[PDB]
Design a protein around this nucleic acid. Structure first.
Ligand SMILES: [Mg+2]
Ligand SMILES: [Mg+2]
Ligand SMILES: [Mg+2]
Ligand SMILES: [Mg+2]
Ligand SMILES: [Mg+2]
Ligand SMILES: [Mg+2]
Ligand SMILES: [Mg+2]
Ligand SMILES: [Mg+2]
Ligand SMILES: [Mg+2]
Ligand SMILES: [Mg+2]
Ligand SMILES: [Mg+2]
Ligand SMILES: [Mg+2]
Lengths: 97, 86, 137, 100, 122
RNA sequence: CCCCACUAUGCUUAGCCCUAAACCUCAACAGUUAAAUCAACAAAACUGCUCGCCAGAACACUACGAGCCACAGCUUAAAACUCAAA
């Protein structure tokens, strides 16, 4: 017949599924430096997933890890640890502007 | 009461411009949601009323974000008429 | 160096000085801006009372107290009594969201005091006492 | 020996381009309104680009320019809609003037 | 199974801290636990003030105790740590390495919900 | 209705009480999106099968009988008179 007819295939141009910054990495409640990167530097409020950019699974992990660290003397509650104020900025939030 | 003081929600005044610093402090509290939390905590909001308010705000957010997306999507069409007279 | 909105850490060493006094030694001006009244107290680093003023102690009574101008009057008076004891620079710790939240701070500025840091210490319970019932207005 | 439509579609330059995102193409300016340039790059819909300030005098009718396509057609489905909202135009970023 | 004891000790001298760690470990062994490893995360200032046994603590040393103990041994150890005056705070949790993190394919985009309302002409 | 003070109560233990706009007022399981899609509105229209329930309004979340740790209670639940509407 005709060899130019379209064939059935999966999309070859399909880009790989996007992954969060913490995809494939363990989250531990003792890893305070990682946890402090997802709380406000003035109030210590836990940022939402619209700010952190994490997926559903890691957002739950960070929230559970932060809550465990706060009660076990690893993470401050009312503020963000000053020693970790110079970490790379990964949350899409701006206060002064 | 048991945390270090003068760290949380503290803004340093630059060159004596107190007006800018206070607005910066006010905006930070608003962005984190502290300002709205305090006002609703003045009088107790019953659980039935809170869920109705939250559902209204969540529905409001969906409509606000969807309408905003369409406005930005159609903003490129705000140019002048390219076929004037037709 | 670039200005940092974050306060210096008491443990760390910082080059910022105000009339030869470090940030931890600056007297503190606590402001309590309630919905009906504003109370301003200035204390030193060693928790020594220096000056206290309020709308009720500055010729305002009843509903007149819950106004910005009344808080501004108290702020000027609080600065005047603090300035007698040698207070120049203050750290502002404002508590409450009352009408005199900012106007009371203006009185301190116009009274001869300098503001270097602003802190909000409004009490927000994290779940706490159940507040009063809603008003049927 | 008649070329079938499937043969025409397979060998057409548009089909062999693949995805239109971040592809350099050459378009022709056919209509100009103020500083808005209407450029047709052989697709179904044309693209509208602002007149560059560096060399805006050269951009005239019939001038060929270089484009980086971002979408052949701009459509998006919003809340409560049963169909996508189409702008009847393409999205492209103007880069320069094609020279031979 | 395998547990992890997030142990925060009062800032003391080396002989006193060393005695406390040995005494705490012996409590686990007396309750059938098999201690795996003893880790030292250092000593840093506590994020918030902690009051315990009518003492105000501003600094404390961080240690981690990994051990294998039966389920019934967890309850007994918690009661033991409360009576110890040299322990600022002691919490027993599952060892995070025991849980296996499921491999994540990525993020699947969520399409806009459709057919939520009838197509009647309102 | 506004303001203040304070008690039952909201908490814990043990035993009761068994009600709600207990409402997502939209039954369980297995399906379909085709025809006539479909009163209206609401949250599109239906198929197979089974169970529960409903037959004008009011009297009536009532009377009586019965059962219940309930005794100013709950569950089950009428009738006469009346109206031509609800
Ligand atoms: Mg406390
Ligand atoms: Mg009482
Ligand atoms: Mg319910
Ligand atoms: Mg029902
Ligand atoms: Mg059933
Ligand atoms: Mg079904
Ligand atoms: Mg219809
Ligand atoms: Mg009833
Ligand atoms: Mg009855
Ligand atoms: Mg009977
Ligand atoms: Mg009876
Ligand atoms: Mg029943």
């Amino acid at each position: 017949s005709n060899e130019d007819l379209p064939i059935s295939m999966e999309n070859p141009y399909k880009e790989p599924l996007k992954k969060c910054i913490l995809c494939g990495k363990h989250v531990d409640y003792k890893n305070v430096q990682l946890l402090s990167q997802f709380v406000s530097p003035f109030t210590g409020c836990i940022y939402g997933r619209h700010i952190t950019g994490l997926c559903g699974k890691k957002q739950k992990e960070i929230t559970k890890a932060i809550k465990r660290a706060q009660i076990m003397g690893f993470m401050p509650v009312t503020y963000k640890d000053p020693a970790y104020l110079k970490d790379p900025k990964v949350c899409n939030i701006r206060y002064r502007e | 009461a048991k945390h270090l003081k003068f760290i949380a929600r503290t803004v340093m005044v630059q060159e004596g411009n107190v007006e800018s610093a206070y607005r910066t402090l006010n905006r930070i509290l608003t962005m984190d949601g502290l300002i709205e939390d305090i006002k609703h905590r003045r009088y107790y909001e019953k659980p039935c009323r809170r869920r109705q308010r939250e559902s209204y705000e969540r529905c409001r957010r969906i409509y606000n974000m969807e309408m905003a997306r369409k406005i930005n999507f159609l903003m490129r069409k705000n140019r002048a008429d390219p076929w004037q007279g037709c | 160096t670039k200005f940092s909105i974050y306060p210096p850490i008491p443990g760390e060493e910082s080059s910022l000085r105000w009339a030869g006094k470090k940030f931890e030694e600056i007297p503190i001006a606590h402001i309590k801006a309630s919905h009906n009244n504003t109370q301003i107290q200035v204390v030193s680093a060693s928790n020594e009372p220096l000056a206290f003023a309020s709308c009720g102690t500055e010729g305002f009574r009843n509903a007149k107290k819950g106004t910005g101008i009344a808080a501004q009057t108290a702020g000027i008076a609080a600065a005047a009594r603090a300035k007698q004891k040698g207070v120049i620079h203050i750290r502002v710790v404002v508590k409450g969201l009352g009408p005199g939240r900012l106007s009371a701070m203006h009185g301190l500025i116009m009274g001869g005091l300098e503001v270097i840091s602003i802190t909000d210490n409004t009490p927000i319970p994290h779940x706490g006492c159940r507040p009063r019932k809603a008003r049927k207005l | 020996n008649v070329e079938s439509f499937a043969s025409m579609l397979r060998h057409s330059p548009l089909t062999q381009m693949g995805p239109a995102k971040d592809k350099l193409v050459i378009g022709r300016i056919f209509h100009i309104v103020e500083n808005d340039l209407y450029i047709d790059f052989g697709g179904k819909f044309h693209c509208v680009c602002r007149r560059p300030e560096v060399d805006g005098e050269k951009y005239q009718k019939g001038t060929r320019v270089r484009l980086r396509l971002l979408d052949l057609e701009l459509t998006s489905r919003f809340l409560g809609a049963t169909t996508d909202t189409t702008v009847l135009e393409a999205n492209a970023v103007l880069l320069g003037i094609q020279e031979s | 199974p395998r547990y992890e004891l997030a142990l925060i000790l009062k800032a003391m001298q080396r002989p006193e801290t060393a005695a406390t760690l040995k005494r705490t470990i012996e409590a686990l062994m007396d309750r059938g636990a098999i201690v795996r490893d003893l880790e030292n995360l250092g000593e840093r200032a506590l994020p918030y003030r902690i009051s315990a046994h009518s003492q105000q603590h501003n600094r404390g040393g961080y240690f981690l105790v990994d051990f294998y103990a039966p389920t019934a041994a967890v309850e007994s150890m918690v009661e033991h740590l409360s009576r110890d005056i040299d322990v600022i705070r002691g919490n027993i949790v599952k060892h995070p390495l025991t849980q296996e993190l499921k491999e994540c394919e990525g993020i699947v985009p969520v399409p806009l919900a459709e057919k939520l309302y009838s197509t009647k002409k309102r």
